Amino acid sequence: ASIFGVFDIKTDAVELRKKALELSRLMRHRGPDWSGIYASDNAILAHERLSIVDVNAGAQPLYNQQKTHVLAVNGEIYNHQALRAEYGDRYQFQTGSDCEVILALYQEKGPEFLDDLQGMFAFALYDSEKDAYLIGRDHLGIIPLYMGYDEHGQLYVASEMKALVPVCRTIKEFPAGSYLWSQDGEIRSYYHRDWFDYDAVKDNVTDKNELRQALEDSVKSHLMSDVPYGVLLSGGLDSSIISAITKKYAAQLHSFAVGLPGSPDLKAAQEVANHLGTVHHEIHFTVQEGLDAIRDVIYHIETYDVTTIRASTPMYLMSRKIKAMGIKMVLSGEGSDEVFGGYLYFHKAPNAKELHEETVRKLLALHMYDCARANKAMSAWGVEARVPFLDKKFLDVAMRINPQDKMCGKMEKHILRECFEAYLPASVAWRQDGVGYSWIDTLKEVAAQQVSDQQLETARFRFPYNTPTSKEAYLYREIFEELFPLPSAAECVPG
Amino acid sequence: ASIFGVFDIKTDAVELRKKALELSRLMRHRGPDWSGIYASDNAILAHERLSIVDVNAGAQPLYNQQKTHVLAVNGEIYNHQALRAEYGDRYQFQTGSDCEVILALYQEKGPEFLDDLQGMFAFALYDSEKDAYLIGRDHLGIIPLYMGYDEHGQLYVASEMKALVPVCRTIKEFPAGSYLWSQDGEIRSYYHRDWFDYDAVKDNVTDKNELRQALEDSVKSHLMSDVPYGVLLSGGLDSSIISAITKKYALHSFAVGLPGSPDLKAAQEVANHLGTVHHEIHFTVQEGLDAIRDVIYHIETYDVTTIRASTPMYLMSRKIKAMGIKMVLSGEGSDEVFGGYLYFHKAPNAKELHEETVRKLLALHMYDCARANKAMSAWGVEARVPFLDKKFLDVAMRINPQDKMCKMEKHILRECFEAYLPASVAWRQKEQFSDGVGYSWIDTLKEVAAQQVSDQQLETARFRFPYNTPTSKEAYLYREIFEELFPLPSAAECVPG
Ligand SMILES: Nc1ncnc2c1ncn2[C@@H]1O[C@H](COP(=O)(O)O)[C@@H](O)[C@H]1O
Ligand SMILES: Nc1ncnc2c1ncn2[C@@H]1O[C@H](COP(=O)(O)O)[C@@H](O)[C@H]1O
Ligand SMILES: NC(=O)CC[C@H](N)C(=O)O
Ligand SMILES: NC(=O)CC[C@H](N)C(=O)O
Ligand SMILES: [Cl-]
Ligand SMILES: [Cl-]
Secondary structure, three states: OEEEEEEOOOOOHHHHHHHHHHHHHOOHHHOOOEEEEEEOOOEEEEEEEOOOOOOOOOOOOEEOOOOOEEEEEEEEEOOHHHHHHHHOOOOOOOOOOHHHHHHHHHHHHOOOOHHHOOEEEEEEEEEOOOOEEEEEEOOOOOOOOEEEEOOOOOEEEEOOHHHOOOOOOEEEEOOOOEEEEOOOOEEEEOOOOHHHOHHHOOOOOOOHHHHHHHHHHHHHHOOOOOOOEEEEOOOOHHHHHHHHHHHHHOOOOEEEEEEOOOOHHHHHHHHHHHHHOOEEEEEEOOHHHHHHHHHHHHHHHHOOOHHHHHHHHHHHHHHHHHHHHOOOEEEOOOOHHHHHOOOHHHHHOOOHHHHHHHHHHHHHHHHHOHHHHHHHHHHOOOOEEEOHHHOHHHHHHHHHOOHHHHOOOOOOOHHHHHHHHHHOOHHHHHOOOOOOHHHHHHHHHHHHHHOOHHHHHOHHHHOOOOOOOOHHHHHHHHHHHHHOOOHHHHHHOOO | OEEEEEEOOOOOHHHHHHHHHHHHHOOHHHOOOEEEEEEOOOEEEEEEEOOOOOOOOOOOOEEOOOOOEEEEEEEEEOOHHHHHHHHOOOOOOOOOOHHHHHHHHHHHHOOOOHHHOOEEEEEEEEEOOOOEEEEEEOOOOOOOOEEEEOOOOOEEEEOOHHHOOOOOOEEEEOOOOEEEEOOOOOEEEOOOOHHHOHHHHOOOOOOHHHHHHHHHHHHHHHOOOOOOEEEEOOOOHHHHHHHHHHHHHOOEEEEEEOOOOHHHHHHHHHHHHHOOEEEEEEOOHHHHHHHHHHHHHHHOOOOHHHHHHHHHHHHHHHHHHHOOOOEEEOOOOHHHHHOOOHHHHHOOOHHHHHHHHHHHHHHHHHOHHHHHHHHHHOOOOEEEOHHHOHHHHHHHOOOOHHHOOOOOOOHHHHHHHOOOOOHHHHOOOOOOOOOOOOOHHHHHHHHHHHHHOOHHHHHOHHHHOOOOOOOOHHHHHHHHHHHHHOOOHHHHHHOOO
8 A cells, every 4th residue: 555644734735635646646556456535624644555454444544433533554463453352442443454453542542552563564643633643654664654844844754755756855764663743743763672782682592492483473463364465485595484384374375486587596486386385476577678677666666776676676577477466465585684694794793792783783774675675666566565574573582582593603594494494395494696697787788888987987976975886876876866856865765 | 458659760769769668658557467568770569468368478569470570459359269260371370369360460461451350459560571560440449549750750659648748749549440551651441331321221121139149249259358357237228238148158247336326226236137246336526536637647538528427437447456357348339339329319310310320439439439448448457348349330230220210219229138137127218317326426526617717717718728628617627637638739639629
């Protein structure tokens, strides 16, 4: 879904509403199902839905029973069932939407219920009674959210920067693990955990069976949906586990892998799918198909980062292929490397202290990284991506085991392999460019054509911020800028 | 799907290729499934697909076995199976696509096979051997297609004017029942029928069974598909007729309206009668209101009537697609065929009637075909219209027009399909003073226009909209958005005055 909100209105609200319709529509690929808008003299909440749960009645914006509170959410509240039970006493549910609990929660706790939600999301809520608003983003910013200001000082928020660039003088990412309560006027962090610090877990007790079961429960809970769903299977450990787990609790399970015809990963993926027994779909794309998509990928992910761009491409095309099949949601394996210190550089880790701090740090930066890519790549085509490895509960267990246990002094994510070896082929289980070498190669080769050594030499004059230092980056930048003129838009991009 | 083509290339081909992507992308809603493209120094063909038939190998552009011929099509060729059979001994089919047949016929007939096809389509074919191209559009302009030229003379073709406006100096609709063979350089009409003239059918007999059978067959042929499809049910005669036949030969049905509308009611009835899985789609006036701009952009017209009518269709499609349906059948064409409108009550004689129907069929491309196609297409949904099938048209257009004369409007049709439906339905007349979708829709549309357009703006319209000046506040409202979206003079001119 997409969310779009305008707060602190100081102008013709009428005109603003007309404009909101326009800007919201810019993100309609995220919510192809239906459009919703709420507009008053003091606030606007525009919504583009992708119905996953409560098809018929999960229409948004969701309204107060009394109709004084209005909510627009992009996300999934996994524990909503539990919450309905708990507050159902106090609040009158109007639908079956998982998102409705935020409305219950707010009614009783005001702005203080963020850590009570389990799931991924971004929302904007408007209380006509108190003439107040609340904006929030999940714990690690799994669901993206941007914010910015008009030349009037009016406040804007949108799932994608794409809808703000046209009106804001400034924009920035809506901080993850946080909320914005109008009465307070300041963004406050709500997500904190003991494990944020080493000295907190340092001599903890690792419980493998706990770890495994934790990931199982995460997956299980992320299976919530009223539409057809699938799993991304790349043949890598992370998606192999997710798919394995998913297969395990699916009770027809579709798997998807993407790549240049004949590439290695494809083979791995096929192997796993065959071992797990899923109805696999090997998506192929040609190098030219990828080239031709670059610009749109860039418009979708909203970045000029080479690596992200190179990687979102395939994902972007896989998504179009999935959606065409009719699948609206998929589970993926992002977060695993960050939780378990999956990177090779982690092999090189100095000690458990260093390891821990790095992973934490990595977890806290994901909203700008893997999260953004997955979400936006998939949403380009109206496909929802779930990340069980990043589930709230799971993380507490995985971040709380002893971090020595994460040290490679073994395969990189040993403990994890150990936990699921049984579910997989020995090959993936203990394995340590699969989409196609040619993919990045032509990429590079095309950049070198399109970019003069001259351009590169004086890039600092053109792109003073995060000056591109290679012709490929140079190329992605030009397009980025072309699409996202505003100077702060590039500052959202990690320097 | 969508088709985008550029021919007679006099500039940097590389350059142009980049632009084609850009422009082709503007119509992606019509072919969300996948994208394809062929680019050379002399021709570009870009396609956005909506896979209905042969999902796995039906990709486009479609190529020649020798890869010397390239074809890009938006359409459904109903008699393709028969053709494959007819021409398989000469042409090696590379796919299961109903559309590849065009490649085969072009191979054995050059540009003279247009009337061999039975279906709806718009296509562009480029022959790298001969360095030539051929553009064609179905018999009544069922599927849309625009043409235009560059400041350099380069020629463009596109399913929607939206893809041309940004680059052409001039533009126009690619003529219906026509083709453009590059070797000719002139657009030629290929469709003509004796029934085009009254003296041709004046003494004809009327075959009820013949007529029933013909509609039946058309529908049967129209069910051709590899994906899930449905029917658009209004509860009105036409759509009810279509629906019943589909049920019998084939089932999800769809109706749209304001909570409480006549259409919604009537459709429920029929759905009940037929036993289809019925989906009643509601919309609110504000949702309708909020969609106007998109609607104008999708349909590419400023015509008040069409806009009114297409809004609900566009919202309905959004929903059908959310349910996963890619194709549906519609009852459009019936009234034009049987003289089903109220005005037809006042027809002086069969001649005037017959003559009037013909006119109507031949203008459809600017009207109802446009709405039907373009409204559904805004959400990647394909609309089929059995009543306008070529072969059906030949039977229906050839019966005694005197049988078209109106006790009830479409009596014959009723007599013919009486069996299928609940009599209440079959002999259901239309009423002036009742709005299917809900009276509030227009009422609000008018209301909004009045409030947004000044008397003066209206009085001075001519200084602003010198071509087909809007004569009402509503017309003005729509025209203003239109112009705003398609800033090119000839665009406005494609819209029938
Ligand atoms: N060919 C592919 N097919 C399906 N999913 C893929 C493919 N390549 C990558 N992914 C997904 O991307 C996830 C996280 O990205 P990463 O771990 O950064 O490679 C994997 O754990 C998979 O769910
Ligand atoms: N309310 C509706 N719900 C579903 N389909 C509709 C509805 N109204 C019209 N249609 C379809 O559109 C066709 C042509 O409409 P018309 O051109 O207005 O007579 C019908 O005969 C139906 O297939
Ligand atoms: N697209 C989304 O963000 C999903 C919203 C909500 N869970 C629904 O399925 O309606
Ligand atoms: N979208 C269309 O015009 C359909 C083209 C062809 N019939 C197919 O199913 O691929
Ligand atoms: Cl800002
Ligand atoms: Cl022209």
